[PDB]
Design a protein around this nucleic acid. Sequence first.
DNA 1: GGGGGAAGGATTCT
DNA 2: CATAGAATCCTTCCCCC
Length: 341
Amino acid sequence: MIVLFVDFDYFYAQVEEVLNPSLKGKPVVVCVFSGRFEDSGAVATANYEARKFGVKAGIPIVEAKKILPNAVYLPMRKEVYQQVSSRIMNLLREYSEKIEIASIDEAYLDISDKVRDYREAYNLGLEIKNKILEKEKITVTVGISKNKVFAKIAADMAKPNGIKVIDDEEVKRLIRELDIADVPGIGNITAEKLKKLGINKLVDTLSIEFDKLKGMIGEAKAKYLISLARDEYNEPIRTRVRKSIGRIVTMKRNSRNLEEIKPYLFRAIEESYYKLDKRIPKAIHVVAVTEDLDIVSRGRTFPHGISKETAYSESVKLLQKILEEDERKIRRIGVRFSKFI
DNA sequence: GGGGGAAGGATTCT
DNA sequence: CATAGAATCCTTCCCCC
Ligand SMILES: Nc1ncnc2c1ncn2[C@H]1C[C@H](O)[C@@H](COP(=O)(O)NP(=O)(O)OP(=O)(O)O)O1
Ligand SMILES: [Mg+2]
Ligand SMILES: [Mg+2]
């Protein structure tokens, strides 16, 4: 194929820069405040200014304020960003039928039936980067290659405000040279396992007895890596269908007291049903994060859709099944719905 | 042996 | 100190044939 991947640059923070251009050049930090104490919570993302000082997606806000006490700290306005993304996504649908929207700020475009080589594909990418920059004033990064994974690797390398092709011949090179922990899907727990077997490059998975590989990292990840190593990974650009909807909130204080937890759980069901927007679910899961930050959950599938009134009743049973079977106190509580009609 | 699908946890991603 | 939405995977279990 020919895949052109787009990922928006420091997206939530960049949208706050468009809406308030006096922030450009200072470090901007977009925060998810949790309500326990002043500045409790996590950073959703930060602009590249702030990243230079190690403030980035995932770290505590209190930690970010020690490093960069004079950054701008905004609360996340997810709905604002979703609407700007939808507009950018609508802009991208004008460059192929086949488009896979992979998150709030990425899309894969199968542009095979639309250009014939990589310099065509490179030019279309420059076109895409300029429209997005005219219509919405957002800079993005483009990766182009022969499949989705190496398109995404290409943008990862070219960040930020970049465009990069990985032709067939560097896909061969990267199969030998690229640190395997830079392959999408290889997080920290898989990486150290791969390295405990002396696997550092994609090509290294061809010279291992397969079941040692399957034994350590699981059957699906082994075939995934071997597929890329063999330059035969191909996966279609597909339309993504939302398979679950849910909400999880953080409680002012920890607790395993049912009457104390219920209002948070119930807010989370209420919001999930708004979000459900006429989709009807057969499955419900209750998710708790314990005081030691373990995640535990209890669900149930029904033979029929769940009314709101049933979700309320059943999620209290599933939360009690949690409080029965585990002794830790609860820090975060949420509900998730799946198996729509 | 295996179709199925659950359930609970792990891992990764944004 | 440790947000939040969501997918896919693994293991075990179960319930038939
Ligand atoms: N850990 C997190 N927690 C909450 N929100 C997050 C998050 N990680 C990402 N997001 C939200 C906010 C992120 O902005 C948005 C896009 O995530 P990316 O494309 O992975 N990172 P960005 O676009 O920010 O910078 P780059 O230029 O490096 O892509 O998703
Ligand atoms: Mg991005
Ligand atoms: Mg992204």
